[PDB]
Design a protein around this nucleic acid. Structure first.
Length: 343
RNA sequence: UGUAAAUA
């Protein structure tokens, strides 16, 4: 039941209310949208004794607030402004309940806030992260849990995350096409050890042809091209070779092709470009097709940018006559710029 | 001229 004090506050009868006046009422106010915003605001100016007064009360109902639409922000504010003993005490209230919280709309924010707020070497977060063991795939696919999984990878020591890696065994193809999985895979590639990522990268290479044309998979492949080891870059490039023209005209894979052109060796780059500028297969100039394609024109620009002088001259000579052509097409109207300021 | 997730 709504106390008179909260009713009175919601009616603006206490225009200069001070945190101290909420003794006994902290939990009630935290579950109220306006009272919660009030407590959030005052915690940022509150003295330490005042924070502690509020803390003593929030600790008593911590789990309840953590899953509350408005109270979860009060909990988060102590992960922001509390001392370590306070944070650890609150995290103690998460422990035992990590899985349900991680799947809960509000609880999942609390968990991420703790992970960002408490040093990874503290026994808690260790205990907290292990609670996800046996539930990793369910969390990864969940709209709330997938952020919790990403935050663990971002904040915790990679060695303790071996269970996540094992969880992904044989699932890297499927999860890379997944709206959240692809994000989880990318955090793994950024944060885990070369030993842990070995099996991930293996499965990525196995399905590169399929992943470069996927709405989410294309991002995972680009990530390896931008941040991976050269030997993995080289593997992805070998899958593109022979398929430049087709993949260049593809909404998703066109992007992968650009990254291949950028991140390949000079030798590899030259062979990719050769496939476009200096070959003959059909009554059409591969370059002509690409120039004015909505997606491929971007690939052509990267090639012009990255080409050796020789290959660039040929690309320019083969575009030169098609000025009027380009004119009509929207997409040729950056290629034309480079042409004019080259001749 | 072109693609990326859950609170008041």
């Amino acid at each position: 039941g709504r106390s008179r004090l909260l009713e009175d506050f919601r009616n603006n009868r206490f225009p200069n209310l001070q945190l101290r006046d909420l003794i006994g009422h902290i939990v009630e106010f935290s579950q109220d949208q306006h009272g919660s915003r009030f407590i959030q605001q005052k915690l940022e100016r509150a003295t330490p004794a005042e924070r502690q007064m509020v803390f003593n009360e929030i600790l008593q109902a911590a789990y309840q607030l953590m899953t509350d639409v408005f109270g979860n922000y009060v909990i988060q504010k102590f992960f922001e402004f509390g001392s370590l003993d306070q944070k650890l005490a609150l995290a103690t209230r998460i422990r035992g309940h990590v899985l349900p919280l991680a799947l809960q709309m509000y609880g999942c924010r609390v968990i991420q806030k703790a992970l960002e707020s408490i040093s990874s070497d503290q026994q808690v977060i260790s205990e907290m992260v292990k609670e996800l063991d046996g539930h990793v795939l369910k969390c990864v696919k969940d709209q709330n849990g997938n952020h919790v999984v990403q935050k663990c990878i971002e904040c915790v020591q990679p060695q303790s995350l071996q269970f996540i890696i094992d969880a992904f065994k044989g699932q890297v193809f499927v999860l890379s096409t997944h709206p959240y999985g692809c994000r989880v895979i990318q955090r793994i590639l950024e944060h885990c050890t070369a030993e842990q990522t070995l099996p991930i990268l293996e499965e990525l290479h196995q399905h590169t042809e399929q992943l470069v044309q996927d709405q989410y998979g294309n991002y995972v492949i680009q990530h390896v091209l931008e941040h991976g080891r050269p030997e993995d870059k080289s593997k992805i490039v070998s899958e593109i070779r022979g398929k430049v023209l087709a993949l260049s005209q593809h909404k998703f894979a066109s992007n992968v092709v650009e990254k291949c052109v950028t991140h390949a060796s000079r030798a590899e780059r030259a062979l990719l470009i050769d496939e476009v500028c200096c070959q003959n297969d059909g009554p059409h100039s591969a370059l002509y097709t690409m120039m004015k394609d909505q997606y491929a024109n971007y690939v052509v620009q990267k090639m012009i940018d990255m080409a050796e002088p020789a290959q660039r001259k040929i690309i320019m000579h083969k575009i030169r006559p098609h000025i009027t052509t380009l004119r009509k097409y929207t997409y040729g109207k950056h290629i034309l710029a480079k042409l004019e300021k080259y001749y």
